[PDB]
Design a protein around this ligand. Structure first.
Ligand SMILES: [Cu+2]
Ligand SMILES: [Cu+2]
Ligand SMILES: [Zn+2]
Ligand SMILES: [Zn+2]
Lengths: 153, 153
């Protein structure tokens, strides 16, 4: 199964995030290319609950968290299903890469098809901050760009 | 269950299409508001197979047709699941309305969540034209705007 989200916004940030998952129990491969970010930085990257674009990136809602866990790093056992950590940007403000994830799925009751991908303007503290907010959003800040995840082939 | 598609394009056409379905076997209520269309006209309106926005409205692919039927009117037994016929535009180029449909679903194997809604620049001939093309696209023409269908609440 393949899916894709086209990230758009009014802040100079844009990109494309592709997803591929063979079967429900297998890892989903997430690959991305995002331009216009601050250079030489780390930016929060997550799947948000709703694929609602009626109000910029605000209507995407919170991090997708069907299991009601706290915000964490992708490698943490305790994390939101949608937690993809930080993406590193180069000297030109480009973030490009790919990784495998076993919580994110394109098949089943937790499918992210129809939800949203959000790239943040700040660094995700991975739930390790001194705040209640750290455990919610990772203090990743603003949402310069986002896109609804659609099914493709 | 609720879903929504925000229609965007570079042709002056834009809008929002909302979907609501209680349970799989029940009709889905489709409501829409679309601006910037030709005034006093009828414009093709359908759900396309892919929620892929990488190439304008082209990447949405063909009309969603899992049952491999020919293109028809919404009230025809023989139609594509995605066939929503024509939407009427007023003197200001606005199309606004709502209808119930029993083939379009937000639940199950034929769910349209993650697919796309496309509003056309021409009138849909409802598969009643003298062509092979009529049975495919209804000769609805260009796709000035489209949006991926996302899950909301
Ligand atoms: Cu986020
Ligand atoms: Cu169409
Ligand atoms: Zn989170
Ligand atoms: Zn059709």
């Amino acid at each position: 199964v393949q899916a894709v989200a086209v990230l758009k916004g009014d802040a100079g940030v844009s990109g494309v995030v592709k997803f591929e998952q063979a079967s429900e129990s297998e890892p989903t491969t997430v690959s991305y290319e995002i331009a216009g970010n601050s250079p030489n930085a780390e930016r929060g990257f997550h799947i948000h609950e709703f694929g609602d674009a009626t109000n910029g990136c605000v209507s995407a809602g919170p991090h997708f968290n069907p299991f009601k866990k706290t915000h964490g790093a992708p490698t943490d056992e305790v994390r939101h299903v949608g937690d993809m950590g930080n993406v590193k940007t180069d000297e030109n403000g480009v973030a490009k890469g790919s990784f495998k994830d076993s919580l994110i799925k394109l098949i089943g009751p937790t499918s992210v098809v129809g939800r949203s991908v959000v790239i943040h303007a700040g660094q995700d503290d991975l739930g390790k901050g001194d705040t209640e907010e750290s455990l919610k959003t990772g203090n990743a800040g603003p949402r310069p760009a986002c896109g609804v995840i659609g099914l493709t082939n």
